[PDB]
Structure formats: C-alpha cells, structure tokens
Amino acid sequence: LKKYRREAYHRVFVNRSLAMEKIKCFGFNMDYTLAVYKSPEYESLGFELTVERLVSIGYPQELLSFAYDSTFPTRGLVFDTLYGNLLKVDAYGNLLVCAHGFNFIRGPETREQYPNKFIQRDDTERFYILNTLFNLPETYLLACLVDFFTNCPRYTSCETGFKDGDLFMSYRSMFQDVRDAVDWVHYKGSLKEKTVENLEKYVVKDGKLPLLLSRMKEVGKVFLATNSDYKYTDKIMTYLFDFPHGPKPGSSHRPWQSYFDLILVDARKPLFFGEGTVLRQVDTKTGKLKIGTYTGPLQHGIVYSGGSSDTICDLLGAKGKDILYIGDHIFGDILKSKKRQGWQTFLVIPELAQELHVWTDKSSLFEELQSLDIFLAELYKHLDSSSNERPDISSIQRRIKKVTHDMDMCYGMMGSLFRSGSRQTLFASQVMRYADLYAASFINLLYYPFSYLFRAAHVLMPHESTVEHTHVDINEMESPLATRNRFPLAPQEITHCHDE
Amino acid sequence: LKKYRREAYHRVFVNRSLAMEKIKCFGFNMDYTLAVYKSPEYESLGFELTVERLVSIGYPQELLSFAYDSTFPTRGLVFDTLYGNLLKVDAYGNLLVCAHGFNFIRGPETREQYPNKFIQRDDTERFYILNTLFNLPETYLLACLVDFFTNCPRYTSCETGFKDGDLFMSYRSMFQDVRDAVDWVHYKGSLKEKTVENLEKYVVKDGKLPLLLSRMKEVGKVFLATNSDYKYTDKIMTYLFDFPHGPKPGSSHRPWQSYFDLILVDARKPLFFGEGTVLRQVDTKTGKLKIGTYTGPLQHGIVYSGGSSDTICDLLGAKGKDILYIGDHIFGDILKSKKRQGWQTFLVIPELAQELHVWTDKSSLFEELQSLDIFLAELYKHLDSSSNERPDISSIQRRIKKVTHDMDMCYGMMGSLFRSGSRQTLFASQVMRYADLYAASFINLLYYPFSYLFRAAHVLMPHESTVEHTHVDINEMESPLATRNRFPLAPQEITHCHDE
Amino acid sequence: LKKYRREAYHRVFVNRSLAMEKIKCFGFNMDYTLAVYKSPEYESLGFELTVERLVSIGYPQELLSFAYDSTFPTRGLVFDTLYGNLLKVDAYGNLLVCAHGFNFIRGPETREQYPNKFIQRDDTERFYILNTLFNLPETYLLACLVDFFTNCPRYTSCETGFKDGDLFMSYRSMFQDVRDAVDWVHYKGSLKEKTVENLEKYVVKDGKLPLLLSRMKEVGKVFLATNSDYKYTDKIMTYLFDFPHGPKPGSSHRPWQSYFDLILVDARKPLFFGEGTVLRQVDTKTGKLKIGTYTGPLQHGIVYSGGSSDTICDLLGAKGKDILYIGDHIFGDILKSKKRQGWQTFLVIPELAQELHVWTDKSSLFEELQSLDIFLAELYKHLDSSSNERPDISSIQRRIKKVTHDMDMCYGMMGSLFRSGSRQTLFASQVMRYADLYAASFINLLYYPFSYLFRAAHVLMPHESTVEHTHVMESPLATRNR
Amino acid sequence: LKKYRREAYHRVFVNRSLAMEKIKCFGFNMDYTLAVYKSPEYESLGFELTVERLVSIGYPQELLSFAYDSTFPTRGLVFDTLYGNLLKVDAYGNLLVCAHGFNFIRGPETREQYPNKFIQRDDTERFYILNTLFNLPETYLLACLVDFFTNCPRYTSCETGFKDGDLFMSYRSMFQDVRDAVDWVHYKGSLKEKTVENLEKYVVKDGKLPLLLSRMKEVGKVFLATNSDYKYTDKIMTYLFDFPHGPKPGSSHRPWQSYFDLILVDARKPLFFGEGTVLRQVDTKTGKLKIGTYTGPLQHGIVYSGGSSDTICDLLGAKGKDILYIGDHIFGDILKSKKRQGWQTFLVIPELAQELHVWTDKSSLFEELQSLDIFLAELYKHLDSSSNERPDISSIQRRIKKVTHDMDMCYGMMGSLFRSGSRQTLFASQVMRYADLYAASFINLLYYPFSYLFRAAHVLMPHESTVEHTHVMESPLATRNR
C-alpha cells in the first residue's frame, strides 16, 4: 500500500530527522509564532504607519494614496539599491523575476542591467534581502515608490535614481529613507500602540494554543524569548490566553505565565545568540530590573530581560540538543558556529497555508503541465544526434508559459515563496539550511505525539527523481568514457554521524 | 501513460533547462572529459608517484607498502588540517561521515572535536575540499598517512598531529607535504610520461567520440581548451582518434585537429576565466610561439596557447549564450560575475556510471527501506499530542541502519558521491549550482538530437514531495494561527526572466 | 637666521601641504568644532546620565557614587571586550599601556593575555576603539565598571567577566549595555536638553568665531553640516553668535544663519558621505520638510536636512578641490574611494591645547631625558662587538623611567593622546592619515591669511633625524659593490 | 656637549628599543643578508633571463634590446594592472609618482585615472607591490614592456592594454606573463646556475662576515634559515667564508657550517612561519632527507630542511624573546598573531648605503631648501586672516621644485626608497612597522657591543618638530575652558 500521512494542513514537514522523544525543552518566539498577526490587516497597518512617517519627513503627499495590496509582495525578494528593482532570485543568485516598480521586466531587457541574469547576493551594500514577515509592507512600499517617481513627471528617471530638478535622488538613498522609516514605526512604538488598542482586529486567537502548550509543559519545560518588552508581551499574551476556560474547556482559566518555565523579554536578538546583554531579573509586581538573579524570595518569579541564549539554557538546565526552538525567523550560521551545542529548530512559515491550498486545489493546472511535458517528450521520442528533425513545439511551449503564469498568479503577482518554475527560491534554500522542521504554524504539533520520530524526506536530484529502481537491460556495452573501464577493511556498521 | 525517457545509462540529466537548438559552439576540456583515464589504474598510478615522491623527501619507507584502494575514497571529502579527519559534509557544513585515518568516528565521539557536528566550510586555511578526480589518490593517501602515524609506535598521537621524539608534526604540515608532492607529480611531468608510454593501460578509447564530435561540428563550432601543453595534447588526442576509419566506419580516418575550429593549450585555468595570460598562436610545424595572431598565411592554423576565455569566444565569434562548455570541473561564480555573458555548462561526473547501477540493481534495498518507513508510519498512525504511547521502534530502526549501511557500501566505504541517508553532499550541492546539464560522460549527447529541449526536473521540497495534488476536505476550520485569518494591476503574461 | 613661526598656541599644524589660496568653500561640523563643549563639565554630564541610565535598567546602586575623573581617560583607547582592558596601542597594534579597571598592568603579566603584546585591530567584534570626544565619559565608565566588579564581594572575578553566583556576566555583555546606554543618553536628547537649558555651563562662547566666519564668507562660501536636528542647532548657534555687536567694531549684530551659504542638519554622518538620505528643505519658521526644494518662495531658504556630501558640494557649485572641511572627527578611507575628488581636511583636536602647555612648561623634564640619553651614549662610546664590557646602566635606566612617567602624568593617567615614550599612538597615526591640517581649534585660522601656503613638515625617520648632513672603506656587504 | 654617535655608515638605526644583552640567538636569512648580490650586475642578470624567457614564449624579438637600467627602479613601487602604471604611494595609498612606461605623469592628468590621487592597496587583484630586491629587474621590465607597446606601430594603445589587430592584450594579462617568467627564471635555477658559475661577479665577499658570526657564536647561538636548497647554500656559503685565515689573525680557516648551531634549508617562507612543512634532517654527504631526526650517528648533524619557525626555535631552546632574526624581507603581521612570543627583527636595507651618501654629500641641496622655506615664511610673517595680500611666491616655488627634483634624481629616476618630498613612502611605513632595527647591512653590528641598549628615536609629529620647548589669553574654543 501507500504510506499513511496526516491530513495535509496538519502536517509538520521534515528537512532533518528529529526524535521528538528527546526534546525536553520547547522555546518560542512571540511575534508571528505565538502572536500571529492577521493578514492583510497588520501588513496594511505597517504600510500606512511607514508611509505616514515618510510623508511627515518630506516625501510627497501622493504617497498617502497608496493602498497596501497583499497580492503583490512575496517574501524573500531582493531589493537592488543600485537599479531599484525587486528581484526574485534562486539559491545561487540567478534572476527569476525582476520588477522595476510594478513593471515586470522580460528576460532580454533584464540582461542590460544583469548581463548574466545573476547577482552577487553577498554584495550586502547593494542588495537587501526582505526575508521577514515585517518586511512585507516595506516590499510593497519600495515598489510603490519606484513606480510613483517613474510615472510622476516632476522627476526624471535615470539608471540609478531620479532627478528632481538639479537634485539627484538615488535608489540607495530612497531605500535608506524607507529603511529608517520602518525602524521608526517599530521602535517608537506607534505600531504596538495601534496593535494593542484593537487586538481583535490585529491578532489571531485560538484555543488550541493553550492546549498544545499545556501538553508541552507536561513532557518538558516551555520558555518564551521575545525582543518585545514585558509591557507589550503581557498585553499580547493575556489576549492570547483570554478564554473562559483553561487548556481544555470546562477547566479553570489560568494566567498565561503559568504556561512557561522562563519568560525572557528585551532579548535583543540576534545579539542574544552571541554574548547578548547582561541578564536581569524583572520584578513584574514592581517593574524594577536588577542584573543577575534575585537572592531573596523574589527569585521565584520567572520573568527575565536581556541575557543570552547560552544563559537561558543554563537557567533551564537544558543542553542545546534538548531544545526545540520555535519561531518565524531564519538565522545565519551563528548558533552552530559555537563551541556550545545549538538548538534544534521548528520554522513557522504562515504563507505555507495558502501555498498548500494552491498545491491541492489547482490540480488541473499541475496535470496539464505534466500532460504538456509528456507530449513534448513524445515529440522527441525516437530522435538522437543523427536526426535532422526539428519538431514543432511552438504552441505547446506557449501553453506551458500560459499555464505556468496562471499558477504563479494563484500565489500572487510575485509567485510562490518557494519556487519559480523549476527553480527553488533563495528563501526555499534558506528554509532547508536553517529549519529542521517547518509548518504553516507550530500548532500542527498538536497532531503528533511527543514520542514521534520525524523522518526527513529525501530531496532528489534529477538523476534520482527521473530514473526508476528497475533493472535496465542494455544490449550495447556501456561506453568506457562513462565507466572508466571499471588495504583498509570496510566499516562493519553504519558510518553516519548525522542520523537523518 | 508515463513520460517516455531514454535508457538510464544514456540519459543527460537536467538541472536547468537548455534549448540545444541555440547552442552554436561546443567547448571541451581534455582531462577526464575527452581523455577519460581508466579506473582504478590511473588513480593508483598517481598514488604511487606521489608516495614515491614523499619517500624521496624523507617520509618513511613503510609508505611504499600502501596500495591504492579504490573502494575507500569518495570525491568531495573535506580534509580538516587541524584534526586530520576526512569529512563528508552536507550542503550546509553539517557532518555526515568522519574518518580519522581508516577509523570511522561515531556521532557522539565526533562531538568532542565538532560540538555542533558542523564545520565552517569557508575556513579555507583549515579545510581543504578534495573535489577533483585528480584529488582521489590524494584523498586515500591522507587517510593512509593518518592511519600509519597513528598505529606506528615511533610516533605519539596528539589532537592536532604527532610527536616524533621532541618534534611535533602537525596534520597541517603533513597535508602541506602531500599537497606539494601531488603538484610535483603533475608539474614535473612524471605522471604524463608514464601515461603517454602506456596509453592502452591508462586512457579509455571509444569510436563514438569522433562520431559525436563530427556531428557537433555539423551544427556548430567545436573547440578544445586544456591546461596541458600541445605535446601532451597531441599524443593523447592522436590516440583517442586512432581508428582505422573516421567518424563512421568505412570512412577515411582524418586527423584529430580536423575536428576542431580552435585548439587552446596552456590555458592556465582557472586564471583563464579571468584576464588569463596573453594569447599566443602556436606553430605546430615549428613549435615556435608568437603572442597575438599570425599576420601571414600561418594565420590558418588553429592552435593557440594561453589567452583567456573571453578572447577565445572572440576568435570563434561566439557569444557566451551560444556556447556549451563540457568538462569535469566545478568552477566558482567566476564566469557569471562578469559583465560579459557566460557559458552554459555540461558537467561530466564519471562516478554517475556506478551510482546509476546501484540505483537500478539494488532495488530490493530501496524497497525494504520504503517498507520499513511505511511500517514506522503505521506504528504512529492514529497518535497525536494527547497520546501517551511510545511504540517500540527499536528493531525497525536497527534494520533501517543495517540496510542503509549496506547501501552505502555498494558505493564504497565513504558512500555515495551525492548523498548520505536523507542528506545531499556538499558536492551534490555544487553540481546543482554549477551544471546546467550533467551525465557520466559527454558521449550521452549522442542519444539526443541537436534540436532537443532539455527540460529541468523540479527538485521538490518536503511539502511538495509528500503532499498529493488532491483536494483535501477538512471538516474542522483551519487554525487562524496558520491562515492568519485570510492597486497595481496583475501581470498579464509570464514574468519568468529565467525560463527553466 | 631661524624660520619665523606664529606663537605656538596660535599655530595650524601641517601634515600635508595645502594652498589656502585655492580654498573657495569652508565647511564645518558643529559639535566640538563651532560648539566646543566645556571640559570636564560636559564629559561629567554625559557620564552621569549614562550611569543613571544603566542603574535604571538594573545595574547596582553603587555606580551612582562614581564621579567622572577627567585625569584618567585619554582619547583613542581600545576596549578589549574579551579581557576587560583599556589598551593604549601604537600604529601597528603593539601594546603600550594596559589598564584593568584602575590597575595598570606591567609588561610581563601583560604577556599572559597578550603573548606578543599585540592586538589585531581588525577584530571589530572584540576590540572597540574609543576615538571621539563623546567617547571620553564611556572610556572612564568602562574602567569604573571593571574596577567595581573586580573588587565587589558579591561577584567572582574571571578571565572574561564575572560570576554572580552560578550565572556568568561577560565583559562583552557588559560592554554592550554601556554601549546601548551611551546611545540611549544621546539619542533620547537627555544630554541635549540639559545642555540647552544651561549653555553658559556647557558651551564655550567666543567672539572670535563670528569674526573668522565672516572673513571666510568674504573670500568664499561657508556651509554647516551637523548630524544634529535644526532645533538644537538653532539654540546652540544662536548662543555662539549672541553678541551686542557684529564681528566688526561697532557693527550691528546679524543672525548666525547669515554667516552660512548652506546649513545642513540631520546629516546622518557617516552615511552622509556615501549616498546618504534624500535631501529635503527645511521651512525654519514651520519646521516641516519637503524632499528636494520648495516649489515657491521658500526655495530661497538655505536650511536642508539629510542629503549627501555630494549633493551639498553640487548645491554649492564646489568641486572637491575647492573645499576645506573643518571638524573634530576622523573618518575612514571610504571617501577617497569615490570617483570624484574629495575634500581637504582640517582636524580640530582640543587636547593639543593642554599638550602644548606640557611641551613648553615641562621643558626641564625633556632636558633631563636628553642628558640621560647623552650620558648613556658616553657609557657605550668605546665599545664594539669585541667588547665584553657590560656598563652598569640600571640606575640611569631607573631615572629615565621615573622621568618619562613624570611626563606621562602631566598629560593624565593614560599619558599623551599622541604617544607613550618613543611610540606614536594609533590615534596619532590616524591624524597623520586623515588630517591635512590640524590644530587645537579652527580659530587658529584667524592668524593666517587666506593666501597662506601651508607647507608640510618632513616626518623624519631614525636614519634621517640622527645623522647630520655634514660630510664624514665601506663594506661591499652594505654597498652591494657599487 | 652633543650626543656621541658612531660614524653614519657604521650605524644600526633603531625603530623600537632593543636590549642586545637579552639576545641569546642570532638568526639569518642568506639571500641578500649573508650573500649580498652585487648591484647592478645581479639585477641585470635576472632581467636578461626573464626577457629571454618571455621571448622564448612568444614575446617580440625587440625585448632582447632592453638593457637593465639601474637608475630607474626604486624598490616598493606598485604596479597597477588596470592602467599599466608604476606607482610610488605613501603610507595611506596617496599617489606620489606615476610612471607609464618611461613617461612621468603630472598631477592633473594623474587625476583622470586617479580622481583622488588614491589607490586602495587592499585590491590585491589589481595592485601588485614590488617590495623585494629580487623585484627590481621585474620593476624595470614592466616599464620597458609598457613603453615598448605604447610606441610600437604594430599595436594600438588603450586605457587597459593594447590591441594587436582585432585582439586585445590587457596589462593584467601581460603582467601575468612577466610574473610567471620571473618565477620561471628563479625556480628553474637558471639564475642560480649562472650565479654559482661566477661568484666573484655576482656575490660580495667580505672577511668581516666570519668575524661577526664567530663573535655572535661566542655569546649565544647562530642559525641560518633560507628558502634555498642545500647545494646552492653550500656553494654560496663556502665562497663567503673562503679565506686563508679564520676570523682571528693567524687563526686557521674552519668551515662555514661550524659558525652555525642550526642550518635550515628549503625553508618555504612564508609558510615556514605558520605550520610550514615537516622537518627533515639532511645527510650532507649524501643529500638524502629523513623526516624527524636520523636514529643513529647522523642525529648529531645540524642541517635540516623544511620545518617551521616554531620547530626551529624549540630545537635551539630559544623563546621568541631570545631571538634576533636578521634578514632583508618585510613580513606581514601574521607572526605576531601567534600565541607564543615572536622574534625581534633586524631589517637589512642595502639602498641605505647610497641614500646616506646623498644625505651627507648633497647637503648644499638641503641647505638651499631650508633657505627657500625660511625666506617663504618671511613673506607671510606679517599676514593673518585680515590680510588681502597675496605675496608673489611663484619664482620661489619654481626654485623649490627644481631643487627637490635635483635631490630626487640623486637617488634615481623614481627618487628615494623612503620618501618623495615631505611624504614617507609605503615602503618606509612598512620598515617602521616590521623592523625593530635596520641598517644597510647586518655587518654594522660589528661596531656595537652585545650589551648595547639600542634606544629608539622619537618620530616627531609636526606639532612636536616645529615648536620649541621654550616657554612663550588663549581662546576657550581651543582650551574647552580648563
């Protein structure tokens, strides 16, 4: 028969095998992990605050006529501050999609600015990668701004920016203003203020969240580690646990703090994963901070501030292997470069919820592309290098392009977060680097036992996915160009020091 | 029905789509491309010459009792010059296999030296990646040397090398001597001399090679670009074309040079792909070099030396897109970082010939692992986070490990070139970065028409490969934690400026 | 006959020759250039607000009993976040002085943490260089913090930090909190607020400033470019120009803005020198911005915000050759990388004021050092490689050490900004690199005409400074047989 | 009374103080340290073999009519592979001299290719620094090649190279061929063979060398560490010590090897200073190697091959403090990074021999420069910012230029190794960084006792060298109101 699998929308997907039996400590980011912001309301709120900010610093009034359009941005686009393009690139820096403003640039014209349809993604001065869910409003705003200055006649388009009279406004300078304004929106607190004053509008709520976290604390420790301050965190978490019952209905409600062994605010991630700041214990009954740990009876509170990830693991008595860290952010090679053991990782990708719907509900699109590809192979079926034939594939290519575009638009104007045609995005490549497990939401762990063995799927290369495990009887001897015309004792047991 | 495909051992595998109709110029490396060296005779010859070299520079006589063992090395291993281990690592620097000498290190012991089972593959001072087919003898020799100094009592093992009396011999110093000696073997010409004096023993020969190259020159230009000098190249190529007939049997034999539009020796790759050296035209009737091009009638020869890849394309009148460059070496991002258009690429991986046999002839091994994995899923079938069950998977894991090791050993002691268990190797990752097409040999193009459209296979992520394109009817509403509780005009035609 | 030179405290010192005749545009930083903050009051103010910020985020109450000690910090020290040391290093990263808290570490134990008495300044993650005048309070605070936790009973000293029970607190973490608090004090305007509310206490005022700027404005253009906003710039600049007469005798007062052809606020240096931000005009009467220029009557206003160094140079019609940029900050070589000719530079270095006093008023210490060296050469005068004599030099070496340390202490506990003994500091090396001219203040341009040819002094090497041009067989090993 | 100093051509110059008393181990490079190659014969030999190598790989026959011109190259020039220029730059990458072939480029057109007269030396791919004595022939050859193709009819000059018809030949490509040919000439032993077959022509000989090394061997240990193999080392060292008497009068000759406690050949510097290669013993009578040490009687031999600097220091029982390493090569800061104390350094700089002759025998040129500067200060003596006077200085500036250029030409067409005008070269800066002591030859240690206290000379800044220690209200803008 076939392998049993849970329903698609409940699945946890496995990049690297993970024995959940061994997880003794579950760690959480808050933003977009426990506190999932409603889409597109929250993106559109960030957009407005940023636009409003730029206008009050001198950007034109026409900006206030921009409306956030959730169908345009995809996450992980690269902004080329030299030519002002949003780029969807693959794992190796090859261009997949190129948008100047809202104008999508065809392949040939792309080669003027990118002669090899390639970017050096390491040129951090030039290219800015919009990876986060917070980057989404900004991704759209950059396109809005490029489009407006392009089409407004008060400004003359040039290769690397706009002339306003005798003044040059480079794309890199505009981007600096957008970047400054997004920070300001977040770090002066205007967005949190608006968020907190209407939580029903802006934050998702779900009773399964206290349920799942209560089960996690039955088998291990549970901790929160957030860059937000305690005041914001308390307001958010109280809302998330505000039900007329506790974990199971008919049970007594209990405060959100009772679900955690350790609560860490003001984390200053990503610095948190280095040496961080000095750890201070927070006295929530007072609000007073004190570096270190309380010596007195106040030591039984669990709210902390600053610190480092290494320190938090000490407080929990949790070795790195024991920890599954659940969040929405792809971190670099910071944690594993350490002499200390790192955390295993569950990556929240909320966009996966819509993408799985495209995958399941648009089958007729996938079927047709498979059809067209099977027909194409039939047209070349018995041809080899002696054949002069040039089969007519013109129309079938045109229907391939037309079906593929239709699929793309099922995701949005910028296509799927994970691929374009046959090529994985840079983002997809980073998901595979960073995440041991991933899902639309951490809540999918509800549907798995804590003894579950998560087994990784082989990611197949072209010669594995298009060759069957069947014996191929060849009548001609294999060319010795291919075969090359083909003592330590062999190891007696498995040599895999990874176990995946 | 199913998609028609050529027989497995004739296939060209596609990472990135390529319209072969547009290829107007075919370029070749010589070594391990046109001139395929017999295995393991040629590896074993390189081994002996290197060992002999080290002995005459003071290394112990016991080295001459080493015999090359083709079942041990896999290509792409990393040599850690700090701890003297051969490492098989994945695309992200995670350890898969760790061999100190001929001792394979289990996972737990690995963590002493690699606390995160991770290496920073960028630490080029410490880690040396043995990617080439020429590296194979050296890969085995490094293991031989570590094993000998470990087990010989005249030397005391330490973490980073050996004590010989009061003298410390670091692994990094030993590696420097091995590296120096391999160079010497190649650059004083001892290996070419031995090769040339017994070409039947050392070089593969195949009549399909003149056939395929004659067909290529029917539709485009053909050129050779080799680091070897003309003298070696002539000896090799004359042997490769030495048949009592030409392209087709019953035709007149013709000299190998008649198969090329341009013959480039002394290329100094990889510098060749930068600014290179000054181009000089070679006068083979004389041997005299002259920088530039001959003004007189000698300008009708086609042998050149030095130069750059940009210059060679000018001579051919070949824009970069028009060129398919066929060879065995994975190059870095050198060619695409240029403002000039780069070559498309066909990668020769000779090991693919044995790997495809494992894939097809050891099906019963693959079937069992699929069985065991289907049984494992059955054991967790109706469990979720409320379940207390801990199903007994002990024996079925043991049979997984035992079957997986058996598969590994079908490839060699160091396993497949492309994966370990569920993880692709670093090498596999580089194949996907660099090669538009790849095969065990370029001769497989014989079985494809020159109008062929090579269409890339999707490389599927876990949520694509383990979810069907079937409509999933859910009775419970999807958690808004996953859905988030979900103007420019949309593009009307495909936006893919890559076309793959 | 000897060369004429202006009086020492009026001099502009010349590192690279500069023909003032060609300067047609004069550009100023404001902070510590036009607005010289009184020392040590201002450092002490920044120190106190930073300590209070730290205590308010949970640092111990004892910190509030630290008093800023201006005799301790010398600018340009390197804080080693690994071992908690303030370090004075030379141009090449050789150790000269090593302080742990307030304990000064001798040579031999220095070698335990620094085996070659060498740091790699490239290690930006480990070593933080405290080069600015704003960094002076933070330099002392770091020393205070390391001293406090080293001698506090509640804590256990370690190599890389301290234990508070079973909890480790790294110097790197602690330095991050000090770093964050100094930013916080500055970017909250706490410091700006206390400054503005008492300008006499914190800001130097001097009628020579309006005189010098009006003379520059007569020979060319003058521009201001500060990171500060307009409201703080206005308060400060209004104070600096608040005199009952204009710059000439019996002339009437005129506003500070009229001394400038272009006023740029919110500069966002150092980004300002690359692509910066988009330039916007400032309506001073309203305080509102508009990117570009106001399309109306307000186009005639001369106050802008943000922008870039290149936009401002084009706005003034000045090529890089025309411009002398006057300021207190040393910038990296990332403005010479541009493809248009960059500015020439005048580095304001306030410490030069007290350093020159030491140079001239402690001449007895220099003379004694010279005698001890002369006397020392006399001891070796008759010896070559054939000599077994080991002259007894310990007592004279003892006296050299005492005298050099006496000199060091005339500058402060960390010695001179520019050197320790025979070795130039890293800071001195960066002045040589960046500053075409330098003085203790820009005001010393008063004493020079705008046609002056500033001529660079040779920096002599040992084989130049210790052999005379006087005319005196030589080994072919030295001659290569020429 | 003035300070006693040894005669100028006998001096060891002191950059960092060094107590020779503490040196217990003396270590030598051989090439250009013990074996000083005669100039210009040796440079000319290397030049000719390199030209012939190039012509034999297809470069035009005209090259064989180049003659090495020793008056052109100064060591330490930077070859710009993009534009074909030899460049003399200062410590910070500022342009001082720019030669294209043999055409010297004035300031203003320099700015077309170098808008800030600045190069980024970090661009290792673009700029190649020609610092070694071995690099002198290649420095001139580069200039010859650029001059040849610029004025050859068959070629078309471009910005970054030349066209040979429809074919482009970049300076970068051409530089690669010169680079490869210089390696080829050296690593084929062509140069070593012609040297050994005529040692009188190419190698300086001097009986003072065996005297100095035997005196070192009496106070401590002496070691040799050369990249050369043993056969070439033996030929050369045998020649250098070939005298009818030993070092003392009427003493008998003894072999060169007996002057060394350890002879290391095949050093593979600079890798030698990291982990190097495995150390092997050399059986001199046989020429065979054995890694480690011979387990027999040959263990008493003192000739090794390969190894590392750390292995050799442990072999001698010398910590880094004990060692003075004597050599002609400037190394990067990648030996101070080690976790054991590194060597102290003596940099042999042959050009110092002729440079000191210029310093003392062209004093009239220095005096005139001094008068012109004094006279120039007198012209400005009475002017300050109120002055409109623009004194006429063109004729005196003209004479300064002529005189400075006259001085430059005493060193050679590229001027002094250490400076151009008021600006130290990049090379001078690297001597300051790397060399604790330096002289024109190691032989000047003869004139100093092994108990000598080498004392460093202050390198004065402009505000130190041009204001007297003599005692002379000051603006609070300079004083910060102290």
UniProtKB/Swiss-Prot annotation, chains C, D:
What is the protein's quaternary organization? Homotetramer.
Record keywords, A-Z: Allosteric enzyme, ATP-binding, Cytoplasm, Disease variant, Hereditary spastic paraplegia, Hydrolase, Magnesium, Metal-binding, Neurodegeneration, Nucleotide metabolism, Nucleotide-binding, Phosphoprotein, Transferase
> Which CDD domains does the protein's record reference?
HAD_cN-II (cd07522)
The linked condition is:
Spastic paraplegia 45, autosomal recessive: A form of spastic paraplegia, a neurodegenerative disorder characterized by a slow, gradual, progressive weakness and spasticity of the lower limbs. Rate of progression and the severity of symptoms are quite variable. Initial symptoms may include difficulty with balance, weakness and stiffness in the legs, muscle spasms, and dragging the toes when walking. In some forms of the disorder, bladder symptoms (such as incontinence) may appear, or the weakness and stiffness may spread to other parts of the body.
Binding locations of Mg(2+):
N29, D31, D328
In the record, which positions carry Phosphoserine?
A: S395, S475
Q: Which gene encodes it?
A: NT5C2
Task: Provide the catalytic activity annotation.
Answer: a ribonucleoside 5'-phosphate + H2O = a ribonucleoside + phosphate; a 2'-deoxyribonucleoside + a ribonucleoside 5'-phosphate = a ribonucleoside + a 2'-deoxyribonucleoside 5'-phosphate; IMP + H2O = inosine + phosphate; GMP + H2O = guanosine + phosphate
The principal location of this protein is cytoplasm
The record's tissue-specificity note reads: Widely expressed.
Which amino acids does the record list as binding dATP? R121, N131, Q430, R433
Instruction: Give residues annotated as binding ATP.
Output: R121, N131, Q430, R433
- Positions binding P(1),P(4)-bis(5'-adenosyl) tetraphosphate in this chain are N131, K339, Q430, Y434
Q: What does this protein do?
A: Broad specificity cytosolic 5'-nucleotidase that catalyzes the dephosphorylation of 6-hydroxypurine nucleoside 5'-monophosphates. In addition, possesses a phosphotransferase activity by which it can transfer a phosphate from a donor nucleoside monophosphate to an acceptor nucleoside, preferably inosine, deoxyinosine and guanosine. Has the highest activities for IMP and GMP followed by dIMP, dGMP and XMP. Could also catalyze the transfer of phosphates from pyrimidine monophosphates but with lower efficiency.
Any binding details for the cofactor?
A: Binds 1 Mg(2+) ion per subunit.
- Localization annotation: Cytoplasm, Cytosol
Enzyme Commission no: 3.1.3.5, 3.1.3.99, 2.7.1.77
SUPFAM superfamilies associated with the record: HAD-like
Q: Where is adenosine 2 annotated to bind? A: M413
Protein name, entry field: Cytosolic purine 5'-nucleotidase
Entry binding sites for adenosine 1: N131, Q430
| InterPro entries attached to this UniProt entry | HAD-like_sf (IPR036412), HAD-SF_hydro_IG_5-nucl (IPR008380), HAD_sf (IPR023214), Pur_nucleotidase (IPR016695)
Q: Name one GO molecular function term.
A: 5'-nucleotidase activity
Q: Which residues bind IMP?
A: N29, D31, R179, D183, K192, T226, N227, S228, K269
Example GO BP: GMP catabolic process to guanine
Origin species: Homo sapiens (Human)
